[PDB]
Write an enzyme that holds these catalytic residues in place. Sequence first.
Site, PDB file in Angstrom:
ATOM      1  N   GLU K 200       0.811  -1.188  -0.030  1.00  0.00           N
ATOM      2  CA  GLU K 200       0.155   0.106  -0.128  1.00  0.00           C
ATOM      3  C   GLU K 200       1.018   1.361  -0.093  1.00  0.00           C
ATOM      4  OE1 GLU K 200      -4.330  -0.331   0.021  1.00  0.00           O
ATOM      5  OE2 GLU K 200      -2.683   0.923  -0.753  1.00  0.00           O
ATOM      6  N   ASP K 201       1.822   1.313  -0.930  1.00  0.00           N
ATOM      7  CA  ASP K 201       2.462   2.683  -1.251  1.00  0.00           C
ATOM      8  C   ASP K 201       3.586   3.067  -0.231  1.00  0.00           C
ATOM      9  OD1 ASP K 201       0.419   3.013  -3.389  1.00  0.00           O
ATOM     10  OD2 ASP K 201      -1.015   3.952  -1.932  1.00  0.00           O
ATOM     11  N   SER K 202       4.298   1.847  -0.220  1.00  0.00           N
ATOM     12  CA  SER K 202       5.252   2.087   0.866  1.00  0.00           C
ATOM     13  C   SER K 202       6.864   1.313   0.134  1.00  0.00           C
ATOM     14  CB  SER K 202       4.969   1.331   2.156  1.00  0.00           C
ATOM     15  OG  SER K 202       6.131   1.194   3.009  1.00  0.00           O
TER      16      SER K 202
END
Lengths: 115, 42, 260, 67, 404, 49, 51, 46, 97, 51, 475
Positions: K200-202
């Site tokens: 999730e966007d990490s």
Amino acid sequence: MNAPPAFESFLLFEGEKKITINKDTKVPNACLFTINKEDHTLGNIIKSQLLKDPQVLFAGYKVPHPLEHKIIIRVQTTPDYSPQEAFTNAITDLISELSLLEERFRVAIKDKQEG
Amino acid sequence: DEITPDLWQEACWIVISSYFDEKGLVRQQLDSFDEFIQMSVQ
Amino acid sequence: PYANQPTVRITELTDENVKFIIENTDLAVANSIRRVFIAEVPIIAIDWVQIDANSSVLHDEFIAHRLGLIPLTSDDIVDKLQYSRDCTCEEFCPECSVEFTLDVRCNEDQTRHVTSRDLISNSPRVIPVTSRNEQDDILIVKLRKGQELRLRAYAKKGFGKEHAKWNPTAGVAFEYDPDNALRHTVYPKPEEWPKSEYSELDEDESQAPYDPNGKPERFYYNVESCGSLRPETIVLSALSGLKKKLSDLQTQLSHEIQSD
Amino acid sequence: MIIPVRCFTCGKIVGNKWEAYLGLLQAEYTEGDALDALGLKRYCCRRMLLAHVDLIEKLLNYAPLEK
Amino acid sequence: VIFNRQPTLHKMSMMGHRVRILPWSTFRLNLSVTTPYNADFDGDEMNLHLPQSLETRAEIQELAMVPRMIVTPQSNRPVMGIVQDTLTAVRKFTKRDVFLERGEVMNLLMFLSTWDGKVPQPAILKPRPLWTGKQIFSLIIPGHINCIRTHSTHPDDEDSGPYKHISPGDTKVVVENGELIMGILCKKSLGTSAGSLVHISYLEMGHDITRLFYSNIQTVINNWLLIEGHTIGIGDSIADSKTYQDIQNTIKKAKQDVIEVIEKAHNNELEPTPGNTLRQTFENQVNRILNDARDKTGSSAQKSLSEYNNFKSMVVSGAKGSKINISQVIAVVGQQNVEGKRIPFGFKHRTLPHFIKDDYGPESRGFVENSYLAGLTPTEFFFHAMGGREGLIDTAVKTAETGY
Amino acid sequence: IMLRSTYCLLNGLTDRDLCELNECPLDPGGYFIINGSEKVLIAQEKMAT
Amino acid sequence: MGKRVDFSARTVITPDPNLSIDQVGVPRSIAANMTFAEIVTPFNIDRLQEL
Amino acid sequence: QPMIYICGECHTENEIKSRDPIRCRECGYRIMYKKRTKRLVVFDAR
Amino acid sequence: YSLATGNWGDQKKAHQARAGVSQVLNRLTFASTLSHLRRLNSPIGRDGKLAKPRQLHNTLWGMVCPAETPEGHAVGLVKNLALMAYISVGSQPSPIL
Amino acid sequence: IFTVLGIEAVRKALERELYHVISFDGSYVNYRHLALLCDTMTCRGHLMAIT
Amino acid sequence: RQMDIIVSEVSMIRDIREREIRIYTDAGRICRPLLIVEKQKLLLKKRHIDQLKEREYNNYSWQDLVASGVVEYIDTLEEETVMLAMTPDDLQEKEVAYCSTYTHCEIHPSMILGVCASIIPFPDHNQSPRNTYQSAMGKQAMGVYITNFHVRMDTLAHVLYYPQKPLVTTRSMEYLRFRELPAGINSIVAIASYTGYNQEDSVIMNRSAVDRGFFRSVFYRSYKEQESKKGFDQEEVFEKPTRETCQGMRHAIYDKLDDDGLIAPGVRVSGDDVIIGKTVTLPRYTKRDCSTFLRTSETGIVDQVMVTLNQEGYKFCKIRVRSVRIPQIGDKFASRHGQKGTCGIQYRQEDMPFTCEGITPDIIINPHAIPSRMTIGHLIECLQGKVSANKGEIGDATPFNDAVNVQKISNLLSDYGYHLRGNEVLYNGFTGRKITSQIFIGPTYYQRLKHMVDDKIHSRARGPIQILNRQPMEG
RNA sequence: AUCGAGAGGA
Ligand SMILES: [Mg+2]
Ligand SMILES: [Zn+2]
Ligand SMILES: [Zn+2]
Ligand SMILES: [Zn+2]
């Protein structure tokens, strides 16, 4: 602000010990070895060496959290054997392997440098 | 005489370079202020 | 139920790298050796800086961080020196650290390259690798006429697990099963993949036939040294340190079985 | 602002190669051939030399604070 | 503590958590509990509130804790499910040809909190002992729950013919006495929809057992994905030359049909349909030529994909993406619309100064006949930027009025 | 005065001369310094007259 | 209807696959600055005396 | 006690007491910089 | 005052004056400085929820960047010059007449 | 609908229209929520706007 | 076109259907330069390109190009009457002629982009919202904002230790001076699912690379102060306060200050410390402490101290404090394609996955960030960057370039002993086993954004309250 | 400290 010192991963805090042994009441002849301030480097070799023992029924390890600096090694053996004895023999076998590997690497260097 | 396609892709960028050698990126600001001082105040 | 009998075959040994093959060992042992090359082979590196004067265009932490990453020859001294944790002295002593001085001033017009050659040590055995008697010297900072850098560093013993500056390797190539016989990789299109340098296949054949009864043996290593240690010294230190960790674990294990 | 000491990826020393790299470039090497001459195999170290911007040379155009 | 993310839209935007002190300076969240908060990790910040009395602590413990919040009263279905990596990886893990070795199985069993310590009998004992991924997920599955689902790739004509109860494609999920008897798990089985395994676990087992179910799926599957691995690259955006040339043939139909329609309209050969003016009928007729083109090229790109494709892998698992995204990356981006219509004539009877006046062709009015891998032409780039701007304006303007 | 404008002291100066006044040669100018704070005028759209 | 409150903290969120769904990973600095008023009893006299 | 400052223009060593307008006595420049302290700041080269 | 505050008008008429002119130059990075110096602004009012002035008009081609726009409450109202875009400075019509 | 058919007819029709708005995008909301909204909206014999 | 009485910026529109000819000379007309076209032929011949090539010798500039009648500024209103060729290939006689009466030609279509969008490599392979988000985020990327940063006393400033020019660049950045003041680093990016800490966007960063200075920055913060002698009633003055005379003295120690009341450069200062000792005369007697403290929880080192006189002419002090920001969990990073994400965890080099030649990624991003976002420019940039690093190039990612597509890059990459699509066999760092999926890895330009977690973390437990309503403060 | 403004983040 919240950065742990880099030495925390390998240094031991006072009063906290390197290894702790705990029955696993799940099943008979099983133990949990909580080893502090070690990581996959020792966990993987100890687990694989234990998997070489035919008297070991289960051998596994986990790093419960990468930000924490301990490993759990679960060892289950046959009833005539002991997980503590299995762990000891695995470490002894790894030590003998590494001693032999070191001596043979010294010989191989010896030969490479002179021919 | 004619720029052939094989040369175009640097002919064009050569042209573009010359533009930015002459004008820059903040030319509108400087020209506006210059016109204001040379004309608009008088 | 017992130890492997690994064999070793060194295929290349230079001052820059060692290329070898360990054969008849487990993949866990091979990877732990690889990991110890990077993270648990101690060397000497600058880990304490005191800037007495810095008129350069790089701030003090920039110079300090840059000095920490200069490799220092650690071959015979690293085994002798103690960790400052273990040393019974004050902040420093010659048994746990090495002194460095640097004192440079640009007087001429024309740019002065403060390089690792300007790091002067009190110990002749522990010096910057580039300064050792080709490759130029590592550039610490460029100084303009009037600028000046005077500092006093102390180098200590540590390994890459604490900071990458104590990592002696400049790349550890590790491989096994160059022909994908164990099928630990699954190529969608095996013909598109280049052959390993250790591959032993005719060019028409893309990967070896699947071996159901195999496991990983014959691991190929190329340990490149940053300069602090020799590559063979990196490998020998790695084997000693891994072993010797296992010995400490065994000792604590015996105490903990005892005490129950 | 200045050439890094180590390659960020592998940790190979690149801080002694910037000056030699520039000398090879003015000697009419291609960038790839120059990187090959300095022994940068891996595209990480080639990235380190090939993508470096020597800003310190511009920072040295300003007179220091003390004469 | 109560953990909250703004905007606090529903009661699952503030849930009770137990504190775990960890080294660095961020709030560390489980990945299933991100969907209730509508939270991702691109710089989102969240608020922690610490109740200051035993009264309020008991209140949050008995009312607002995350396991009590698994099923939402809004739509009688789970609000949190299995999410990106765990979902792609559980899809790959429960495929029929996933065989685990003894050491791998023990490594995965180290990460089961609810494990009785008994290694199951392997599905294959000879020539080698091998466990299957379904056999380990059976250990993850709690209690004795029973569940029937169907994988997203389940063919619709399989439930009628033979092989209903022995599926060739390993679709038709069947969990029976808490063992995954068969089927590939995916969004339909572990997501937030009604009747899924997580929902049935919450309904049959309690919220504690379901909490452990979530955690165990995530830990086991992530540690297996350390072996399997998942990626995406250029190779997943490529198609074979057969497919490319099928897609180009389809697009060149579509344009050449739109030209057909444009001459009919120009020669007054086109008569209106009931309920629309002649302009609107021409626009319908062109838009439905071009949507047929986009759907057909998308189909071609879909069928070209392998089951090593990672785009496909994430679309079957339901972890991320859709088939239309694959079509746009591989086949054709398609028609760009502003306000639900083709690109408007913002110049004098022109969409751009690069077109002739009165050009209703597909290029001129904003049909992107290229894929994202092929790359857009400058006019396609501008028209696509116009459509995306419409999306951005909608996102930035609906919020005030929905919030009011 | 807008910086780098015709009436600015940095006008026509070489990269030498700018550096030798502690100015960045790459600085585009186009802004004012009011009370030490660099202020930039944003062009304002308006409907033609 | 809304107001500012004590005993609140805010920071960037980060993934953690090794937390349970009902756990939140919190920094030492937030936890050291946030406090809970625990009542003293013979049950907790010793522990609270260490704290 | 002296608190010597450096000139921003002429880089000249010069002492200025409190309640004195800040002006270099080489060149009258109005901007002055303090000298680097003489305490011992330590850096871990990390 | 007007360049310091951005309130474009007399200091007494501090509410009839239109703010947002004369912003503090962004010096975070060189690109931010350049973009801030090439920034255009459509004073329609951020409160307005009509999308039409926020849409990317066809006529922005070559004049305004199709992409660079804040994604918050001012989407399409704050714009940026295209690279070769030049805003005319004005001229006298008498020679032409 | 209210003017012609009455308060219960508009209750039903308002349920219907809200359900159409909600479910057009394939979404689903439990009927008790729509029912409660529509009852708040009609319990006083007239159409009570949510304003 | 002759630079006669009509100047270049004059717009002259002929509406033909309605018989108006509208001439505009006023200011504020946005226009752009375009190449004039003859019958079907550019007026720009090779003689002009030749003279432009030696632009530094014969002083043949743009403005001569305009004077030659080869280029013309066209405003928006006159574009309505213009027939544009996108490229000179549009002028070329075709089997079916589209226009055959062009009047102008684009110099290059990529000039439709602005300053920040001209940074994006392969922007025509991304979804347009991604290009917008990057155009926003390039302005938060760290770099060297200006060369003379050592002398500026900016309130906030971030300088990256080791800015790099991108390996994959567009031809527009040569004029944005991005090569000369770049705002990122070329990172070995692997797009992989590794341990779940990049979901999730990490991103997962290499701890060892961070130890070597990877994306390290320095944060400069400037504190103002002035001592006002506004009247004999009360006067401020810089001077080391004392416990016996000053009233509002905090318990913080003032030993770091000098006699003059100003801290010295090189002094390490922690949160709540005093950098300026200012005392104001009263009407704990006859003077009250009004010292300047550090903004709490900063922990920097005093970079420098400047003293001068303001316009009216009292003492005025500026103190720049310096704080090294080493990237950590929660710091936000972004590529040039809208792919932003915070650092989820940092692994050491032995914990990261490695290729057969021991290359570990600097950053690992999750594959689930690609499919919905459709940032294929990220993948093409990674592949082009692998080619560029192996070849000793800088890649050309200019938007609309038919001489560069994915096939030709893949064929180039296959010549350097790599899988043509940028995939490699990686090995698990923890166990050393090969990963079953071959991972997509290569150099990608990443940006460290201003949003660091240490500037965002905040906690409260019974702090100060607002005066009007006795509620907790704001901020 | 208050007020306003602006720029940003999700
Ligand atoms: Mg977010
Ligand atoms: Zn000592
Ligand atoms: Zn390298
Ligand atoms: Zn002076």
